[PDB]
Amino acid sequence: MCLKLNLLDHVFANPFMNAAGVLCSTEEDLRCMTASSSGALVSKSCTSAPRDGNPEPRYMAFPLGSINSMGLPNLGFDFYLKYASDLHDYSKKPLFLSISGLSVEENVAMVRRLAPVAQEKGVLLELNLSCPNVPGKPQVAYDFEAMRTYLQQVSLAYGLPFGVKMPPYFDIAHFDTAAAVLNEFPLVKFVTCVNSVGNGLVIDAESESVVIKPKQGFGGLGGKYILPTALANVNAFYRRCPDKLVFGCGGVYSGEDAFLHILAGASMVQVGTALQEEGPGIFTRLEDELLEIMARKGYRTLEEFRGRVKTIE
């Protein structure tokens, strides 16, 4: 029985990886993700310049999930590029690099420099169009004209296969329009669904207080709260983008959650909140639990059930 996958011209031991932003900021974090049993890893979304991000507390977790308004802390593009160029051991696993510049121009500037490294090393770009936690910068992918602009400019400037990190949508018309935009861009080879469910508000009853400091306590939700949202967006894009790959992200704590993602159409499966709370040992557990489910059902490979969710009637 077999968790292996071969996509985007890379071989993966298994479909699991961190979600961008979790355990991927520093050289130490990246070496740790590389030493884990994950199939791949993705670096922290980066900006051209280093950023401290928001004041603390800016992340909090609870039994049903997490809220964050990190504010895009990162070591800067120069660092992640060097990591991809000189530091990462590609014989261990493939590496994705996530970028999230605050304007199209900043993105374009980064991808121009990433291109020769991607050509030479095989690093894969994840372009983040869904940051919900910068004030005055609502999610780019909630504005379909802006989204089209960003993807035009990045396709032109980069000219290699890349993927995009999408926010969650909640409306059939938005699924239809968003997939249609993405389908205009043949270099977009994968779509990662989803980023956090934006601008939730956790309130502590005892202290009568919000639990994160930035934005008056408003922040992106992950974890158990979001699984069915995440599964909907995976399947919605899987059905709407038949020539692209869909990576799942949201609500994965178990092999069973990963199984559902895969049924829904996911190729890679990313782990955020649960990985933040449990640490990189989660990857061996998720592998075992997914293999147990497959063995019980008679599935010998991932592609035997990927996208095979049944509807009624």
Place this chain on the structure above:
Amino acid sequence: MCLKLNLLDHVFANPFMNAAGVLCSTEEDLRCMTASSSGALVSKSCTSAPRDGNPEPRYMAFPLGSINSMGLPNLGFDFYLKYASDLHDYSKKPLFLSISGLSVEENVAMVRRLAPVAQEKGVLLELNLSCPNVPGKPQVAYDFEAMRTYLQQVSLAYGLPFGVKMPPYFDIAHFDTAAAVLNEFPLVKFVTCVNSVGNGLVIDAESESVVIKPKQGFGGLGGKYILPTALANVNAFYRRCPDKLVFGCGGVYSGEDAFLHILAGASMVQVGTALQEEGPGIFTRLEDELLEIMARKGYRTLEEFRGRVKTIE
């Protein structure tokens, strides 16, 4: 100690009511909600003509909440109007009537006939802008030009105070624009936040199947999944609509959950999924639990903590 409010020229014994669509479809249901210890009730959202709604199964519940694509089954506006005009005992509690026509013209036709019964009996209109389960009819309040048209035409035709049931938003810019649209209308006196989180997907791992039949298994999420999203929206609108009331709905299962809604800004607190699962006895428990949290903290009135959620720094 007793939980009294005077909102919208009506008196209420406590801030609890059903969420529209739960336990409010038939005469029996409404008599049941009237006989409960709820502070008020709201009728099932109605259309001009009766509707059978979508094929079954169309609702399912789970430890973390519910998914539904009911398809707006209802007995038709003539029935709900007649319930309001002739059958409801206003001496027991106030009644809200929810309308959800599939076009601006259908809503205008209904409110013209509701107006005389609102004038005679005091029934309160809740105009639903947020139904996520009719195929080819995406949520009206996710299109701000359509939302404006609906509130202009209803305000003109109805000419009396009313409220609106809103879908959840997830983006600060959308909160800003949605609240500004609402603020253009002085007859909109209350804003109910929120309707179900639209188009989630629940998948059963054993059967590999979606669990509802309509829309390929896609439906609105309610229950524990949505509490932080609901809090966010109640607070967002409470902050941006200082001259309107905010009614909270989403994820209420306990007195503590209602305490958080009120802290975030809620005047009335609506109970959907939990009421569907537990039944109308929930209302005595919610009251008892809310009173007990108030006593332990020394609050004697709701007014003392409504909207008083603390931020950090």
